[PDB]
Each structure stands twice: as structure tokens, then as C-alpha cells.
Design a protein around this ligand. Structure first.
Ligand SMILES: [Mg+2]
Ligand SMILES: [Mg+2]
Ligand SMILES: [Mg+2]
Ligand SMILES: [Mg+2]
Ligand SMILES: [Mg+2]
Ligand SMILES: [Mg+2]
Ligand SMILES: [Mg+2]
Ligand SMILES: [Mg+2]
Ligand SMILES: [Mg+2]
Ligand SMILES: [Mg+2]
Ligand SMILES: [Mg+2]
Ligand SMILES: [Mg+2]
Ligand SMILES: [Mg+2]
Ligand SMILES: [Mg+2]
Ligand SMILES: [Mg+2]
Ligand SMILES: [Mg+2]
Ligand SMILES: [Mg+2]
Ligand SMILES: [Mg+2]
Ligand SMILES: [Mg+2]
Ligand SMILES: [Mg+2]
Ligand SMILES: [Mg+2]
Ligand SMILES: [Mg+2]
Ligand SMILES: [Mg+2]
Ligand SMILES: [Mg+2]
Ligand SMILES: [Mg+2]
Ligand SMILES: [Mg+2]
Ligand SMILES: [Mg+2]
Ligand SMILES: [Mg+2]
Ligand SMILES: [Mg+2]
Ligand SMILES: [Mg+2]
Ligand SMILES: [Mg+2]
Ligand SMILES: [Mg+2]
Ligand SMILES: [Mg+2]
Ligand SMILES: [Mg+2]
Ligand SMILES: [Mg+2]
Ligand SMILES: [Mg+2]
Ligand SMILES: [Mg+2]
Ligand SMILES: [Mg+2]
Ligand SMILES: [Mg+2]
Ligand SMILES: [Mg+2]
Ligand SMILES: [Mg+2]
Ligand SMILES: [Mg+2]
Ligand SMILES: [Mg+2]
Ligand SMILES: [Mg+2]
Ligand SMILES: [Mg+2]
Ligand SMILES: [Mg+2]
Ligand SMILES: [Zn+2]
Lengths: 56, 159, 104, 205
RNA sequence: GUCUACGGCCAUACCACCCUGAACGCGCCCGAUCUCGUCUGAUCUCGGAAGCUAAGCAGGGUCGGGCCUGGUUAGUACUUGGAUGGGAGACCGCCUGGGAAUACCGGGUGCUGUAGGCUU
RNA sequence: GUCUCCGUAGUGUAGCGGUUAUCACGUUCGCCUAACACGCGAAAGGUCCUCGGUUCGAAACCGGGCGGAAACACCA
RNA sequence: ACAGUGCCAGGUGGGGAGUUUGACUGGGGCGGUACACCUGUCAAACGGUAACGCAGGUGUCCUAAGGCGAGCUCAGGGAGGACAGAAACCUCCCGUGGAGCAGAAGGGCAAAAGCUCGCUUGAUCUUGAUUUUCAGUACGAAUACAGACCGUGAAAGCGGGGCCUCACGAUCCUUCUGACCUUUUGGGUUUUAAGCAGGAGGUGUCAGAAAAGUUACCACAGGGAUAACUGGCUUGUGGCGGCCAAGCGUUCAUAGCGACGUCGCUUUUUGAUCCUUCGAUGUCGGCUCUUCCUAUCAUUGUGAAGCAGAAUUCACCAAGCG
RNA sequence: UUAAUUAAAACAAAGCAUCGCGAAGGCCCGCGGCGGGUGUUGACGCGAUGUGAUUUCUGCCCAGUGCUCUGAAUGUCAAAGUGAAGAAAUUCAAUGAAGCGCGGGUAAACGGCGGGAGUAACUAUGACUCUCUUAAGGUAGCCAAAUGCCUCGUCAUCUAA
RNA sequence: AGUAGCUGGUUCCCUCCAAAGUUUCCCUCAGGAUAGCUGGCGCUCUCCGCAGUUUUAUCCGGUAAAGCGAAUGAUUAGAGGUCUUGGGGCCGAAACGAUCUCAACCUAUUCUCAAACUUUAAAUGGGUAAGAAGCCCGGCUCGCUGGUGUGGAGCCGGGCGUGGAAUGCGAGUGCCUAGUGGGCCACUUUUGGUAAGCAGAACUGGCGCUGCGGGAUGAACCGAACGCCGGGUUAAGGCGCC
């Protein structure tokens, strides 16, 4: 026999039982997906930071 | 059912405004976008490269990556009962600096100035905003003029 | 679809762009001693009838054309397979198009 | 031949014109919208009555054709074949479909064009008659008789505009004298205090 | 007052017609040896400096079209939320808030950045 | 009603995207015969059903109409 | 020395064996494909959103219709010029795109994304990230980069296919390409074979079984999720009845009728739907028997006629009796 | 003849007509053999079909599907065998049983057996003609037949109907 | 003891929490897997964070309405021009000569329209921001960028608490997990259909799972949600008699 096809009825009621939570936020966000050429230099910058340790 | 086409339903969304077609003004390419910038995404049909998907049209996100032509934007997207932080690569024709924070950055400097100034005068000045309060008592002068009497007008069939 | 019989493209052995001869790729004839064909022969022997599916419901009407490229560099002569999209008609080095000509 | 007009009385569907998507629509019953002395100048017929719809409904092109005949015949009998000008003010653009049964049933039920109707709003004029002032009673009777060809409720209203123009009759005469209005056949053109001053020279010479 | 080069916004800058343009500019303009390109030195490229604001260009004008911006349209049309409101219905009124668009009427007609000129 | 298919000189009919629109009968002219018929030599004649479209070019290819002809319409 | 027999091999083989004989679906079948995709609309101004909803397209096409650069400007119109005419080619003028951009549509595009030339193969090699569908899986398609090699241009740059939104395919197997590659079992050489990475051969029921019927001789498990009676909602169709009044009726709209229109009622027609019943409500018609309705054919009492009489027609109270 | 819903028009039948076979055979059984049935048989026989007494007749079609007949003349064609290459596995080649293809026969084998237009001195028909057309284009008969939808066909008879 | 995605059954009490009929994939449509919805076990903190809400800023949109003397498409009526074309005429020796006359054309008007039209353009709505993960200073690293000690990013040290709108509220996080995956109804919006107690969607709320007062009666209407009681008062509804 034929049956119902589609509905979103009752769906926003379900979504809100445990809340529509926003994504979690951390002060440090991962560098995944940033420009590879830019990231290569940022690692070189971090690597030699200890050179200027005495001046600081 | 509907199709899963990428640009379905964008007949008006991506079209150019009335009598605003043709060349893209070059100040669109001179804007400087840094990491951490808030930008409003607005797809533009004139440029078909780096187009944001329709769901990201009219949303505002944060820039996390800058390439030669595009930026990476972390923009929230609600899918059923969850909100995902989505990372999209959009060409800089389809974004614009958001003014949503400028009112805030204006207030901080005004706040930081007033906070500093009031401190060296030994006074307290309000820094937090407030909702508009109820109007306070005042006098309304008649000026020796009786208020104009108003009456409802008779019905008229102006058919 | 009409493809030239030569193209200067990247050669992986040389590591640089080189002229290549272009031909069509043809499936080779099956070996009787490929493990899959050997296993098939053993499973098909004796009784039981057919032991593997035989595909009937063909739907595609064309194939993807695979170009066989060969580096003309005498010392390299490397080869590579390059597939292009589906087409009902394919030829190599056919007559090039002309514009503003009378169509007799 | 057609279903009774109760089956299509109400504006239940979005407007469905005869277009490149709706093809095969039969011609409407009403093809003439103006009869009588159409050529009378603006000044010969100052009086104008209306038949105004009091309902939001669909009027079939057959009812518009019938009413036009009913209203026109009376005017010819009581005012002469040249004492009036009638204008039907509704055009049957909305197409009505039929799902013709004898059997699939409701499978593939989208119907074929059956006819055309005019969608009329509350307070919208259905048809208008302009004539001389002394024929006021003959206009009202002509429109009263034409109310019986329509479903729903209509109101006969004698307009305060001059003829078929948009300008009030109590000031139309002055506006023509001052040359703010220029007779242009059945109607009048409005002359603003704008544009090239050579137009003003032409009118005033 | 203003122009030239390069611009930003992209008609308040456009379109049509008319008037006026000092100086410097920008031009029209005069040639084809060279560079360069054409059926054609018209265009493009190159070498110039007799003439002219005729034109482009700039400024101004038009009860000008457009465009920009107000008024009216109008607290109208539409609309969020409410009722055991009306009405056979179609639909409508009221309560609580938001609130348009023509026609019609008025006003305006580029601003401005960098650099370099002219203008006692 | 669903499905399939067809419209070309007066008649019946071919047309393998560029034809001087095929074939036969028919019609007109001239010979032959005293005359008809048969026979021989010539000629004319297609709204390629209609509208629209792609195509360098549509009778043909693709959609919509206008006529027409087949095949189905079963279990109660 | 063949018949024949034993064992292999090819053919034949519904005589016999086993098995299959899609799905959606206003019942099923027939018909379609709403089964994998794409455009506009529905869709209620974020996105999403259904029906065998509406209007359409898809399984291709392209050595250029890809890439770069330059130069040009299109549809249409006006006015002129031998043959030349509605339409050939030449010239000037207007021209915001009314053209073209392979195709469906929508968007986009004017010293260009179109047209014409010159040179070319960024439609090449390579690792990750991201987007779309989404479960935030796969595929497909697409977006930013990064590393090589290149093309083009004076250069800035642009280009890793087609201006954008579609144009497509797992595992197993086979086939090709790649390495001074690994393994090929006690060691060594060599053929072979298997591995590793990337293409192709295909599943269109398109996340991908290998598949014809008939049963009225039929079977089982179920189904009122689902058809064939009644009943229920609805009333298009059927039936019956009004309203307006152009006409008919010699005359005269309405004695009696009545077009074009329009408003209803009924459930004694047929439909539409699938709510009840498939651990069964006995399926047509007649016969017989009772009862009820009135939308009245007759009869009682009446009103009106184009009611002289007779006959007839229209209407009223009216279902007692036929 | 369907025991227990069908007694019949169904089945059988004589008659008729086909088909195989001369015994190392036809047809059939059987896991098996110097096996078995027909067969204690021999073509006036046995085996396999169709039709269905008598009477009269049994038309055309071999294109289709079957069946059947001819075959080195001869395309495809397995194993084995032969030849060559190689270290061998292996690869290649030549050769070519039946069967299929190729060609005949056959319908009392399964089956099949058209369409359009014009035309006779009133009208109607249209013997006649032109044309497209298949392997034949339904012949002798017979019919609203147990076979005709339209259909309760049309005419006549049978009835008051 | 064949298999059964199918029918039937499935045994004590109280207490606490409490669904789904929806997404995607499946020879998937009476069934599964999958996400969602539930329960249980906790644990990490607390006595800043968050929110089915508004406020203030800031973006997004093309529906309702409107418009068509604005583009596309459809559509009615006249009016003025008219040789730039035609039909009727009409005087001729006849031509663009004359004469009219009706159409096509052009110019200003005019009636009426659009789900697959649009210059305009709401309400309701969708993002974002409203601080210490901030702000402001000084320095250091870089193979990235580069006229420039330029830019950009990172890192180190230092100073600033009026914790920078309202209101409310303790939060975060992890494992394991059942049933469900036939729904149906109403206000409003809405597709097909003559319509249907018909079929199909959006939003919210219901019934399903739920009693109770009222609507005589009734899954869904109106009021209101439930431990066992006494008193008071009410809602929606009522007050001739029952
Ligand atoms: Mg379901
Ligand atoms: Mg074997
Ligand atoms: Mg509707
Ligand atoms: Mg001067
Ligand atoms: Mg010159
Ligand atoms: Mg001048
Ligand atoms: Mg103006
Ligand atoms: Mg200026
Ligand atoms: Mg067999
Ligand atoms: Mg079998
Ligand atoms: Mg099925
Ligand atoms: Mg919405
Ligand atoms: Mg260019
Ligand atoms: Mg690169
Ligand atoms: Mg291109
Ligand atoms: Mg497998
Ligand atoms: Mg060994
Ligand atoms: Mg049977
Ligand atoms: Mg049967
Ligand atoms: Mg029934
Ligand atoms: Mg009826
Ligand atoms: Mg009369
Ligand atoms: Mg049911
Ligand atoms: Mg139902
Ligand atoms: Mg029972
Ligand atoms: Mg009973
Ligand atoms: Mg009665
Ligand atoms: Mg018996
Ligand atoms: Mg018996
Ligand atoms: Mg026989
Ligand atoms: Mg034969
Ligand atoms: Mg026969
Ligand atoms: Mg016969
Ligand atoms: Mg058992
Ligand atoms: Mg099942
Ligand atoms: Mg499958
Ligand atoms: Mg069940
Ligand atoms: Mg929309
Ligand atoms: Mg509207
Ligand atoms: Mg429903
Ligand atoms: Mg339940
Ligand atoms: Mg609950
Ligand atoms: Mg309850
Ligand atoms: Mg009640
Ligand atoms: Mg109490
Ligand atoms: Mg009571
Ligand atoms: Zn090489």
C-alpha cells in the first residue's frame, strides 16, 4: 500500500530536548587547513625562537 | 522531490542587482582580510569561481586562512539538531568586512577612554549600556490653544 | 572526438615535458595462467554448472577512451595511460577544423 | 457542456494564465468589452455607473458575456443605440481545469483546461456604463438586471468621476477650461506644469 | 576659478540640443624616412608643429527625458500574535504590534584621492 | 481512455540531411488507323497535412496542432 | 580387427532435475518511471520541504567549443549605392545586448565570457585540506592552496579542461602502465606467477543478484495496510427544483413554455475515496410478505388556462385507498 | 467415463490417412550384463501419430518453425594426433567428426490463407479496369450456426403480442 | 524442535525517568542497518558559562502587497500623425497628380493581468557581535613576503577589572543503551481534485502514551493536566425542572 512520504513534523521538538548546542570554542584553534607554505615558515619561526632567548 | 543541484533555487540570490551588472569595482579586491576578521558572505553571480554554497549566503563567519585570492572562513551551519562550525574557501569577491563588531570596538575605546578619564577625576561614569527607559515626567504647553477636536469621518462608498 | 597523434606533455621518467606519440589503448588478451583465471578453471570443472555470475543487464553504450602515450626520447620510451571522457566516435589525428569555409 | 458555476466559484488556486506552460486553452466566451457609442467624446457622457463586486470570487467568461448582453440590450431599448457606452472591466485570464472521469481515478489527476474566469476582488468594478445625466435611472436598471447573471453580491454605484476618466466631475469642467485636461477621444490627457515650455506655447496658441 | 596623468565610488556623473571657453594642457591637425600594421598611414605604429577651437573635452542653459532624493498615496494595502467575534459561505470587523509600492507634487544634477601644471 | 503508427501530382505509391521530389496509371499534344483501341514520339501537373524550432541546408530531424488506422481495456 | 565395451572430447538433449521470473504504484495488472542525475516553479523573501504535482532536459558534444594574448562588437533598425528585387555585396548612422556563448532552463558576460586571428596542450605529473549530497560515509562533481614541469603574454598575470548549475560506477576478477621495486618458502640463476601504485573493461533496479511463463487442479503465512457487496463522507455525472427574462405563444415575457446566465436540493444512477469487515456479514434476478417516503398516475376537496361543452394542461391541501 | 456436485456434444470405435522399421533392426524398459518387452513375432507384421461410420469432397501456401535428404565441393568446428620456436613450462601454426551454416523435398507436419481507387445511357450494384502488395492472398462449401462484437442484424413464417 | 522479514501468546508488587512513527542506505516498501528521540552508569568542575526570550548594532532575503502611461509575456478602447506600405474607392491621357475612405505602422493616452514576470518592496524570519581567549605597550624568531627594520604570522615580558545591554538559569563531558522507524488531528499557510471524514506538504500545538471540569453523547474542541485528604477560590462553561 501507499504510505506517508516525508515530514519534519516533531523534528524541532526532538532537536531541542537536548538543546541545539553551538560548537565548542577553545582559545587555541587547530592549524589544520591553513596554507602549507605559510605553515612551513611558521614552523621555522617557532624552531629558531630560542636564538633570541638571551636578548629577551 | 527536489534535485540535489548545487545552485538550485539561486535564481535571484546570485543575480546582480538592478543596473549594477558588468565590471566588479576594484575596491572589492583591495580590501585587506586578516586572520580573525568577521566577514559577511554574499555570493556574487558575476564571478563563478570560489562561490560559497547557497546555505552560506547571508551568514557571517571568521577568517582563519588567507590565500592569494580566497580566505578560509569558519562559519556556523545548523543541520537538524546540531550546529557545525564549517570551513569554506571563498574568493574575496563574495565577502565583505562585517560592521557588526565596529559598534563594539567603538564602544571599547570610548569605554577605555572614559574609564581612564573618570578615574583621574575621581568620578564614576556609566559604562554599560541600558535598555531605553520609560519616559519621564514633563510638561506640555498648550500656548493658549485648545487642542483640535478630532471626529471619525462618515463612511463613503468611493467605489 | 578528434585527438592529435602527438602531444608535448609531462613524462614521469624524464621529469620534464617531452613529445609523446599517442595511440589508443587496447585490452590485451587474457592469460590462462592468471591466478583469477586459474581459480576460475578449477571452480568451473566437474559438476555444479556455472559457479560465478554472468553479467547480462548491460546499460553503457560507450567506453572511456584511454590514450597510450610514449616518450619519443630514444633512451626513455616510457609509457602512460591517459583516459578521456566518454565518446561514441573517436579518431586519432583526424582532419583539423576550419572556419569560414564553404560546406559543399 | 460545462460544470455548474458553483464548482469554480472561489479563488482556490493561484492565477493560471494562458501562457507557454498552459497550452491548449479554449477561447473565452466574451470577446467584446466595449459596445455602444465607443467614439463619443469625453464630454458627451458625463455620468458613469459601476457594477462593483462585493465578494472575492471567480466570474466565468460565460457570465461576463451574458451580463454584457443583458445590460446592453436594456440600454439600447431605453437610451438608444447611441446614447451610452458600456465597458466590461474584467478579462477572463485565470484558467480552470477539469480532471475528466468516465479508470485511473485520482492517479495523474492534473486537469486539462476547461475554461477561463476573471478573478474579482471586493470593491472591484465589474462593468461600467457612461451616458448622459438624465439617463441615471436607465443605467441603474441596466446594471440591476445584469446582477442576475453573476454569482455572489454586487453593488450598483454612481461614480463621482466624469465619464470614464479619473477626474472628479465637480471640477472636470474647470480643469478643461484651465487646460489641465485636453479631450483625447473617450478620455482626457492630463497636462502638468512640467516639461518643455514649447508644449505650453502650443496649448496656449 | 580650472586642467592634465593615474584613480575610488560608478548617471546628482547618462542622453538630446544650444551658448561660452583666458593661460597651460588635452586635442583636432601635418607627414610616412625610420619601428610597426593596413585593400586603404582611415585605424594602429612612428616623425612632427603650419593652422583651429569647427569638433572631442570643460563650464553653463532647457516650465528637457533619465537618474538621485523627499512628499502624497497612507497609518491605506499587506502583516505577527488573540477570541466560545460576525457570517450558510465567500470573506469581513475588532484587539495587540510591525508597516509598503504606483500615479500625482516638489527639490537636486557628481563628490573626491595622489602627483603635476595654468590662473596678480 | 493508454500505447503504437500514418498523411507526398487526379488514383495507388518510392524517397540511403544537399534529388532537375521515383514508379505506374491517369490527363494534354502529335503520329499511326477510314475511325476507335492497341502501339510510337512528346508535354504539363505535387499547398511533400498545418504551425514552430535546431541545422550552412528539413519532404526527411525534434516539439504542438488537424485528420486517420491498428493493439489493449483484465480479477471479481 | 570392424560391431562392441571401457575412458576422454564436441554436438543434441523440457525426456528429466534444481531455480528465477525487480520495485514504485490512489488494489493489482496494463500504462508510466515520479528508480541515478540536472534547470524554473511549487516553497509560505535564510536553508530544508511531499504527491503517478507543474514546464523541461540528461547517459552526449568539443584538438577546439581546452589555455593564453591581441584586435574587434553583437540582434535589430534607418538612409544611400550598377545589374540588385522582401532577401546577395558596399557605405554612413542609431543600437544596454533586445545577439552569441554545444545542449534544458535559470544566472552571468561588451576594449568580454561573444566574433576573428597568432601561439599552444594547465584536458600533464603529485601529497594533503575543504565544499556539495551527507550518517557530516562512499562515489560523483566542485573550491582554495602547496610541490614539479610547462604554455601564453611586453608584462602584471592567467591556465592544472569546457563561464556556472548535470553529463555517471564499489568489492572480486581481467587488462595496461611504473620501479636497477618486493616475494616466488633449503640456497643460486632464469622463465613464470603473486604483490605494491595508477588507468580501463560494469553493474542505468545507476551504494552495484546471474534469471521466462502459466495455473480454473492449485497450496501455505498473513492482510481489512489492499481490490470485488452494503454502510459512511463527497455529488463531478445522473435525477429533481428555483431565480433573471432574450424570445416562443397570430397579438401578449411569465395560460403554458423559455435561451444566454446563475442558485440550489436528492442519494432509487454512475463515479471518486478506502473508514469498517479477508480465524468469512452468503454474491444477480424472480417469487413471497410487511412496512414506510412523496418528487401525485388515479380517486376526494380545490385554485389557473391560449377552461364554450367534452377532452386536456398547470398549481394547491393531500400518501386514505389503488 | 470424473467411487463422493459434471453421463455429456467429452473418451473409445469401425473407417480413413500419414510415419519408422528387413533383426548388429524399429519402438520401449533397465543402476548393471552375452540383461529385458514387442517376440511362440517378420511388413496382410510390430511400433508412433492424426482424423473419426457411411455419402460427397478435401482447394492454394515449403516464406516461418519443424522433419527429412546430399555432401570434402566446404565457412565455423573439441579432444587426441602432426609440425615449428623456446631451457622448459608454454606459445604458435597446419590439419578439420558430428552438428551448425549452404542446397533440395515435404502441409491427411505445426500452421497460414490482403488493401485502396475508378467504372454499365436514372438510382443502386458494379462483371470490367488501374494500383500497393505477400509464401499463398480463403477455393468448394457453410453461417448472426455450440462460431457475428455492433446485435434484440434485416426480410419471411410462427403469436393478440 | 526444518525455515518463517508473518499471525497468536509471553506469568509478582511498588518507586523514578520516559519515546518514535522522521534522516540516509538497502531486490528497500508488513523488514533491517543508520542518525535522531529514551534510559542507565557515572565522572570533571561550580555553589564563569549558558539560553526554542528580548534589547542595541550589523548584515541576508524577493514572499504578501504593489507595478505594467518600467523590461518580458498577455490584453481592451478610442485619439493624433502618416507615406513608409496595403485594400476600397475616385477624376483620368496619368504619374507619389487629385481625392477621399478603412486598415496596417508611429506617437502620446486608456481597461485588464502573471506559480514557472518585474523596477519597487513588507510583517514574520535567518546569521553575526555585545570583552580579560579583551585592550594597550616593549622586545625576539622566520627558510614566508620585500625599495624600506617593509608586511604577515608566531613567541616572550609588562600594564590595565566600572567582568562593559535586559531577564532567567549551575554547568561541562564520556561510555553503554532499549523501543521506535504504519501515525493521525486542529488554527494558520498550502499542492492536486467538483469535492470528500480524499490524497500530499510547512509551522506550532495536540491525540497516539492521558486521566479530570465543560461541549447531552464523542481520540483530537474549550478549560486544565493527575501522589492520598480537609477547607477556600476559580477556569472554560453554566444557574425553569431533569
Ligand atoms: Mg513510513
Ligand atoms: Mg566436465
Ligand atoms: Mg487548488
Ligand atoms: Mg586660446
Ligand atoms: Mg593621417
Ligand atoms: Mg565651440
Ligand atoms: Mg527633469
Ligand atoms: Mg564637475
Ligand atoms: Mg530438457
Ligand atoms: Mg523443469
Ligand atoms: Mg508491487
Ligand atoms: Mg521560509
Ligand atoms: Mg580580449
Ligand atoms: Mg602549480
Ligand atoms: Mg570557452
Ligand atoms: Mg564480493
Ligand atoms: Mg631447488
Ligand atoms: Mg483450465
Ligand atoms: Mg482467472
Ligand atoms: Mg461500494
Ligand atoms: Mg447536475
Ligand atoms: Mg413574440
Ligand atoms: Mg481500510
Ligand atoms: Mg486513509
Ligand atoms: Mg465475524
Ligand atoms: Mg446473517
Ligand atoms: Mg406534497
Ligand atoms: Mg461425480
Ligand atoms: Mg450423476
Ligand atoms: Mg495429421
Ligand atoms: Mg519448410
Ligand atoms: Mg483464419
Ligand atoms: Mg467465400
Ligand atoms: Mg514444526
Ligand atoms: Mg516482510
Ligand atoms: Mg541491490
Ligand atoms: Mg500487522
Ligand atoms: Mg521564490
Ligand atoms: Mg502578487
Ligand atoms: Mg490529510
Ligand atoms: Mg501505537
Ligand atoms: Mg508526551
Ligand atoms: Mg490530555
Ligand atoms: Mg452537542
Ligand atoms: Mg476542594
Ligand atoms: Mg446543564
Ligand atoms: Zn621520457
Amino acid at each position: 500500500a501507499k504510505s506517508k512520504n516525508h515530514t519534519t513534523h516533531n523534528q524541532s521538538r526532538k532537536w531541542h530536548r537536548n538543546g541545539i548546542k553551538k560548537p565548542r570554542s577553545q582559545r587555541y584553534e587547530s592549524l589544520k587547513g591553513v596554507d602549507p607554505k605559510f605553515l612551513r615558515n611558521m614552523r621555522f619561526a617557532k624552531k629558531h625562537n630560542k636564538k633570541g632567548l638571551k636578548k629577551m | 522531490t527536489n534535485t540535489k543541484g548545487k545552485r538550485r533555487g539561486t535564481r535571484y540570490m546570485f543575480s546582480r542587482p538592478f543596473r549594477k551588472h558588468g565590471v566588479v569595482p576594484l575596491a572589492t579586491y583591495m580590501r585587506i582580510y586578516k586572520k580573525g576578521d568577521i566577514v559577511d558572505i554574499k555570493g556574487m553571480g558575476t564571478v563563478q569561481k570560489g562561490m560559497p554554497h547557497k546555505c552560506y549566503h547571508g551568514k557571517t563567519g571568521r577568517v582563519y586562512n588567507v590565500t592569494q585570492h580566497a580566505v578560509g572562513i569558519v562559519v556556523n551551519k545548523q543541520v537538524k539538531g546540531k550546529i557545525l562550525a564549517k570551513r569554506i574557501n571563498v574568493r574575496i569577491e563574495h565577502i565583505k568586512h562585517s560592521k557588526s563588531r565596529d559598534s563594539f570596538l567603538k564602544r571599547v575605546k570610548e569605554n577605555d577612554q572614559k574609564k581612564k578619564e573618570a578615574k583621574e577625576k575621581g568620578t564614576w561614569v556609566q559604562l554599560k549600556r541600558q535598555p531605553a527607559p520609560p519616559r519621564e515626567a514633563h510638561f506640555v504647553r498648550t500656548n493658549g490653544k485648545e487642542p483640535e477636536l478630532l471626529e471619525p469621518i462618515p463612511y463613503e462608498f468611493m467605489a | 572526438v578528434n585527438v592529435p597523434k602527438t602531444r608535448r606533455t609531462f613524462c614521469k621518467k624524464c621529469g620534464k615535458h617531452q613529445p609523446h606519440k599517442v595511440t589508443q589503448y587496447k585490452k590485451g588478451k587474457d592469460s590462462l595462467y592468471a591466478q583469477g583465471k586459474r581459480r576460475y578453471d578449477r571452480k568451473q570443472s566437474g559438476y555444479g554448472g556455472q559457479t560465478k555470475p554472468i553479467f547480462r543487464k548491460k546499460a553503457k553504450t560507450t567506453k572511456k577512451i584511454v590514450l597510450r602515450l610514449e616518450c619519443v626520447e630514444p633512451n626513455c620510451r616510457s609509457k602512460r595511460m591517459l583516459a578521456i571522457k566518454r565518446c561514441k566516435h573517436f579518431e586519432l589525428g583526424g582532419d583539423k577544423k576550419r572556419k569560414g569555409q564553404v560546406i559543399q | 457542456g460545462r460544470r455548474p458555476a458553483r464548482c469554480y466559484r472561489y479563488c482556490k488556486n493561484k492565477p493560471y494564465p494562458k501562457s507557454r506552460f498552459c497550452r491548449g486553452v479554449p477561447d473565452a466566451k466574451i470577446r467584446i468589452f466595449d459596445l455602444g457609442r465607443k467614439k463619443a467624446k469625453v464630454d458627451e457622457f458625463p455620468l458613469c455607473g459601476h457594477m462593483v463586486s462585493d465578494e472575492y470570487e471567480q466570474l466565468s467568461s460565460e457570465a461576463l458575456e451574458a451580463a454584457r448582453i443583458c445590460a446592453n440590450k436594456y440600454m439600447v431599448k431605453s437610451c438608444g443605440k447611441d446614447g451610452f457606452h458600456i465597458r466590461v472591466r474584467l478579462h477572463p485570464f485565470h484558467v480552470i481545469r477539469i480532471n475528466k472521469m468516465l479508470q485511473t481515478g485520482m492517479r495523474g489527476a492534473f486537469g486539462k483546461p476547461q475554461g477561463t474566469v476573471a478573478r474579482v476582488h471586493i470593491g472591484q468594478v465589474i462593468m461600467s456604463i457612461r451616458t448622459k445625466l438624465q439617463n441615471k435611472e436607465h443605467v441603474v436598471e441596466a446594471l440591476r438586471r445584469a446582477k442576475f447573471k453573476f454569482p455572489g453580491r454586487q453593488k450598483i454605484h454612481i461614480s463621482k468621476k466624469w465619464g470614464f476618466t479619473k477626474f472628479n466631475a465637480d471640477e472636470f469642467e474647470d480643469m478643461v477650461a484651465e487646460k489641465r485636461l485636453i479631450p483625447d477621444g473617450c478620455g482626457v490627457k492630463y497636462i502638468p506644469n512640467r516639461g518643455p515650455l514649447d508644449k505650453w506655447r502650443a496649448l496656449h496658441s
